[PDB]
Amino acid sequence: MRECISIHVGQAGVQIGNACWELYCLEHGIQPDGQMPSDKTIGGGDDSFNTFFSETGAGKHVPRAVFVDLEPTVIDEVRTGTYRQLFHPEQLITGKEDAANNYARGHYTIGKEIIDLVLDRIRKLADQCTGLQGFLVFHSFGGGTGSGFTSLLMERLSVDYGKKSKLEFSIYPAPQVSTAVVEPYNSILTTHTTLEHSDCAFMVDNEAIYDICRRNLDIERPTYTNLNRLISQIVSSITASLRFDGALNVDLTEFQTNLVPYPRIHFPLATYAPVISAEKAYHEQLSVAEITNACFEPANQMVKCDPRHGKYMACCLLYRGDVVPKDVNAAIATIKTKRSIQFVDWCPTGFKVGINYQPPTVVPGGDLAKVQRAVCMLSNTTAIAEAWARLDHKFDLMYAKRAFVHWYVGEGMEEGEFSEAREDMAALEKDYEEVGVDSV
């Protein structure tokens, strides 16, 4: 009970979903055919892993997931790949022509033709839930589908499932892999449209993931497979609280209470450690203190920004593996006495901690070394606004000349939606400034 439905939208969402569900199957001992020998309750159960997997009478464990894309080539690779058997065909939904990196096509023109089918397929998953908790939506900011259709979906989910919770995993565009000039336009349009419909959004900067793969894994030129496998680890650490249970396990919802002081301020900064190659990991086991220190080195953040030059509203540490509270408290004490950690005056400075004893798993043939303990830090810092600022600046440069705007107007959008969305971002940037000022 307390099930979660994952929705993977667009190329980035689908391929990241591929890596995530591959990792989930390994962590839970589920085979590519869906069989899990260790589950003795056939066809059902109330185990922790049943929050992400349903069971069939034949013993198959089926992800509670929906994959959606406006063109079929990416989901086709799932339909013929190692884990084809895992998903029932109805969970894999494809159009025929994509959004061509145009938010309008994903939200209006092309998204309009398939939205009802998607909602009906999502409804079929919800009806299988005894106590559905909410949704996990994986998508990119830059893609026309990842931005436009996601916005449409989020709007429609708020109507069909009231305020039932919806979490985002959003891919922030980076020029090193972003092959589209219009991704700033799509980013602002979708952030504006989903803001009222998202309770918590975890942003992943491809540049940050790109640098981490180059720096810590010594991959000269990482691929999407390298980036996604790393992203899966962060996603797994965040969702491990929902899929496993224990005496030190803190539910993600309990963390969410601390991470969202205001509804609009729901963008946590994620930091993960250790990311280490098997060549380095050999004869160098990292301690609880070492990985905790890494959580405050900005080179390990999912989003490029400077916490040192901002203020904290919350700090959460999610450990998994061989970790006990004593070592955690010691490491936190040393870090507090050495590093620039300033909280806003209106919130306590404590750190909320959770521990999962199931250790991290790595995909066979990957670049990550298997480690005995790992940590993901979730922090509400004003520094995250730097990401909005960089993106808003690029938006302003092109929109002042109306560059590429005709592609959106041609699909039925009005200039007013652009200015309306940009103004919302201006308020959002101002909101972050406000929350950081000292009281009177």
Partner: protein, 425 residues
Amino acid sequence: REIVHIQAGQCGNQIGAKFWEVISDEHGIDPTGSYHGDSDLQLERINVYYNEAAGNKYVPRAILVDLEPGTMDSVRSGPFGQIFRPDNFVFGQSGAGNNWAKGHYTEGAELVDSVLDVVRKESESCDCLQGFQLTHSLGGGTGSGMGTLLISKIREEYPDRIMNTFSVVPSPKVSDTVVEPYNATLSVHQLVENTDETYCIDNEALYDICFRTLKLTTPTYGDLNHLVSATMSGVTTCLRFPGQLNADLRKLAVNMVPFPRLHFFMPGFAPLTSQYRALTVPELTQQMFDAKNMMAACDPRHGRYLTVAAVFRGRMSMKEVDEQMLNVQNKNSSYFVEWIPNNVKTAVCDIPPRGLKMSATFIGNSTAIQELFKRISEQFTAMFRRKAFLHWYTGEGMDEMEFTEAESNMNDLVSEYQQYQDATA
């Protein structure tokens, strides 16, 4: 004179379970409900907390409540899981998410009627109901929100019965979430009106005691609950065992509560445990009046005692306790109000707790309890002046004046403690 016990929420049900474990051992009841004790004094007042079922089995008169089944399933599996009446487990599925509004207004309201049904069935089987006791925390949502909701409903159906609580007060040093000051402030306003006695168990003190005095580097909730169960056993010893003290909940409240709103007590215990050396009566009295043995993080020398009750357990010189009890008076005579003569009570129970030849429980009605409410009020205002984390509550239907009203009532409670702290004859 039967008591009805209620435990609500994660914290309430765990400290409640330990409680039934401890007193069950003292009364000679095994995990299955069968009596295998040596003395008839164990049974003379077993009816106060236990019903006698078919087969000469004794069943706690307890009701178990929570909005999520997690902790209650653990209780049903724990050591003394099988002793509770199965129909007395009343739970929901969703939970309260550490939200006072969900426990008090939305999620708890859905389940409250089902809980009161079990209360009625337990009360109808009472020869003469004496009152209720509730175990719960004030920082969460179920024990805090729904717990106070239950209290309001019980005072409606049983307006002339005593309602007491063992309430765990939140502390940043032992904190699950940041909205804990909000939930506590909303709960206290309810306790000021609808309870006769509230024992303020402060997690700040329980941690400081486990760490500083007991020298425990990494205290767990289990370590803190060992202190809580021992105290609740000591507090209830005056009713559970047969001295020449005719103690009833109302009579005890009449003797301890000079003013209706000032009914928040500081518990204390001695010796503090987690050795075999026999403790001396002078040592027991000196420790039980020491700030290091108090369950509320307040300094008694920063306020004054309205009333005090000391309970001694074991076989000792009743003369010597009086001499030492009369002695300690002088060492803190300035800290006792002179306008309530003979305001220090002493009780003795021949039966010691488990693995202790002599123990002492301390119950103090001191104006220094005010320090605790100021602490919570500060943490409350630090967030409320910026309206931080309020959306969690406004989303459940609450208005901001309800927060302002609760704030003002606690500041009123603080001011009321201050006037009597400065009052003289």
